[PDB]
Amino acid sequence: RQKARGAATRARQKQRASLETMDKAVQRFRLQNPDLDSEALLTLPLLQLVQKLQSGELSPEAVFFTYLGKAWEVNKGTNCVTSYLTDCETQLSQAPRQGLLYGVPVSLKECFSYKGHDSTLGLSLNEGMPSESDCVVVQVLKLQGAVPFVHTNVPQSMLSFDCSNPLFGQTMNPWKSSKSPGGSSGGEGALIGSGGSPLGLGTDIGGSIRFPSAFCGICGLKPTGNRLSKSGLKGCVYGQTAVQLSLGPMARDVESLALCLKALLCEHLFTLDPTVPPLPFREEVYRSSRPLRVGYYETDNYTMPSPAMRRALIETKQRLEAAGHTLIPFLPNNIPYALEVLSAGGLFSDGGRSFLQNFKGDFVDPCLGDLILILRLPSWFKRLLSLLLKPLFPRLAAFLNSMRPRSAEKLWKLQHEIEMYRQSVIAQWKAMNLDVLLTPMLGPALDLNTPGRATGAISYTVLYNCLDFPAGVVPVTTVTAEDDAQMELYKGYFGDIWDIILKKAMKNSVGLPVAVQCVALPWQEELCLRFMREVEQLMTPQKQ
Template identity: 70%
Template sequence: MPSWTSAPPRAGRPWHSSRPAVAVLVDVPCTADRHSLSEEDDNIFTRARKKERQLLPMLQLQLLAAGLLSTRPGGEAVYSTCSLSHLQNEYVVTGAIQVLADQYDIGVQNQSVDSEGILSMPLSGLAQDLRNGSLAPEAVLHTYLNKAWQVNKDINCVTDYLDECESQLQEVKKQKAHGLLYGVPVSLKDCIAYQGHDSTLGLSRNVGEPDTEDSVVVQVLKKQGAIPFVKTNVPQSMFSFDCSNVVFGRTLNPWNPAKTPGGSSGGEGALIAAGGSILGLGTDIGGSIRFPSSFCGICGFKPTGDRISKRGLKSCIFGQKAVSLSMGPMARDVDSLALCMRALLCEDMFSLDPTVPPVPFSEKVYASTQPLRVGYYQSDNFTMPSPAMERAVLETKQRLEDAGHTLVPFLPDDISNAMQDLATSGLFSDGGEDFLENFKGDQVDSCLGDLIIILKIPNWLKWLLACVIKPLVPRISGFLNSMRARSARDLWKLHYRIEEYRHSIITQWKKQNLDVMLCPMLGPALNNNYPGKATGAVSYTMLYNCLDFPAGVVPVSTVTQQDEDKLVQCRGYFLDIWDKMLQRGLAGSVGLPVAVQCVALPWRDEMCLRLMREVERLSPKIKPRP
């Protein structure tokens, strides 16, 4: 990992330098090669091949952090290619430390800047102090830039430094009216388009293909005064709840590096949990906001699919309509999620994307204190909950009852069919053909498990294998059979069945006269590389993408030794390989955060957030990660 040093460059490749180094800023040990960046001309980066160009902003972030911490202009930076990427092609980069030092000289070493105080502030307080002038937006931005770089050295969560953030900050300061997120640094999931930067999805084919314009959500963030400053890592293709790819490598869970941070918004979850970002945006098509939030001990919210614009999101597959994708916020507390939703649901959003219903955030619903009628279940009878998951639901149920709310047992019907047939068939209705196109000429990351191999199996053989293995592993047989390509007529029928299933659950819900629902959330974090071996465990989250219900995650507890001891009895309902891998993946989790999931009916997003806030208020505070 990088270390700060004043030693001169070691012998090896000839250095691109016309004089002895004054001070080394970044020294990265590397077995392959080392390079230097010294003050030479007015261009920060003058030469790099296409596949390496997208790595350069991360080097700039390293230099920025170093410059803010300790250096004086005219120094020399030493770095290694392999520290930035698994793409270990050699290149020489020349530039001017003076440019960086002059551009970012804001006096972070000044004792008047309370970096720890800034990092400890909740978003609501930080935003208020920024708007009233108590805090300088430059100090906040550079504090979080520095923190993001520091935590990235340990957990590898940042993929791109958005170097326009400094000029964007100056533009925001010129605005007459300060938006709700004025001066707030915001991190973005890799797939969210930002002009001039790649959205790689962890795939080599997307490296060096910068987006030509900002996504709608980025445009709205900027209009609200927010400062997007980094992009974060995802699993290759984003079809995994792990977080590793062949371009940027593996992101680690800040609570325990042996555990995954979850995915596919795993870089966001890890960065926020480690303190390197106060607010992030992720996407969710099967739990991709909720898994990282649960595994990393933060809050995350998946709104109704069309509540926030998805224009400008990059994906491995386009045109899939059966299972709803959502974009949503991730943060340390529920009020931060609500503030982000409040800021995004504005006239700018509705104007930039007229397909988004012009429905502002309902303060009345979110602020209400009326008792709630809450449905709950401890298990979906498809994936056996871990002891910590079940305990988290029961303890939260009791706290809600003690606070005057009514709790009613409620389990949505036919979850098994929704998982094995409806959701899986919808995601892979072409047999995975479009998805597989993304992997041509690329290595397949281990986090995807056997997915690529399975999708490459011919249709007839998928059907035959599904029939053969059904008596032994009926659950896996159902998934395999649903991964076959289907005709347009069959796809229409599938869409109709999903619509009918959705309305049947709404009818079931209304018969119980429920306001909201309390559900288990998969957790604690699995061991690295285990999500791809325990695919069935997506049932707790995928259901609500299939239904297109808003859903959010709130941490409420941590794993106890008693939970760990009981895990040996958690063998699953099917005793298949997915159950076995889930049990193994959950082992060794004492002290890790555990969450619950809150759900509401479509377009009742504020009601879902209200339950989340109530759960948060009544639950013991989870200590920050060790």
């Protein structure tokens, strides 16, 4: 463990120097610009902020250092920032004036490769291996006048919806220090959620944009896998295509997500990565005020919603009805199958071998729970345990069996079943003539170190990675003391360890944000955002 300790010492020194540099830069600017109303600057919605930047009312310098100062401050309570992207102060002066994001500071999840910086993923083997170019989406952000300013924290190896690693440590929810910020885009959740960044980028293969957005009370969108460029993204495993990885915006309101999506969906992106279909942002779809046919469920019969989740869902259902929309009961078929064999088997087709190679000689962060221990088990023993667990705890047994290695032949079979399943859900959708789908979103935030032990609770998010449908979340309410007290009546549908842990983990959540999930068909990001906009306007009208 000498190698791993050395990596942790190096990374913490780098993080400390980053924060110091940040601190000195903001102190210098504040003293040189004492009359600047920093509070008003920071409370500006992004759209108003960009219009002031475009007109020249606010300088890019003013916006930048004010946000840097705020980022530095919120980090003290959250530990969300791993790295200051030092060269940003010169990109600031060079920002293209006609750019749609001119002078907008943007936070980046650590896996977004940035020249001269590590993308560690909390892994020793990636420490001291800086990237030698910006990833594609970073290049286009810069060409649109945006200024990426920080790298934000992720759970070790990024397969966790908590947010801790042995290198930069544990990220905390800004609303409550004992709560997880979610993950794997947890640092983004904490930074944006506390006001330290107006716009961020995250990734999602099982919920990693949506979890931290919901837990930290911000908006996030997970597009169709290939709507945006993955070129230059750092990951633990490459070449897994059964369950689609996506990247997308995270922000304080829906309009910010739409703006970022529009800015990204430009000639620069389509030229820099020709593999991405050149689908322009269709403004006509996003701005539509036509009444919607909205499918909805208030439970997936897999993860029992918290009282706060259920109320959030019913209330927005009611408000959408009152607004003239048609609400139709709808549940994607065969959810247990889609999670237990398709999703779990898609993510772990090789039994976790590729994934495990990253952990050789490294600490295993507590927030990952028993994942690594389980994956290390021999395939015969996984099968054996699965057979024994099945009569008593079928959820655990199904996952365990699906986390075994298989042949290329069996992968083809799985990929085909994923295609057929996607077809089946599309057919259901069509048969009910839906435009859109409203679902619950896992919340309120779980206690630190519990997401790793409540695996079933990914049911609400991972389904739409498997299906590869655009899915976003919007904050709609907060946990009342009434909601929180009702957790004592929560039993889950199965009563296995996942239910038991989840019950405990969702307690003590008064005042915490609670979200709802919005889904559309593949390539319909604009329609998904149109529906997110509607939810936002109805449930939280002050946001618009």
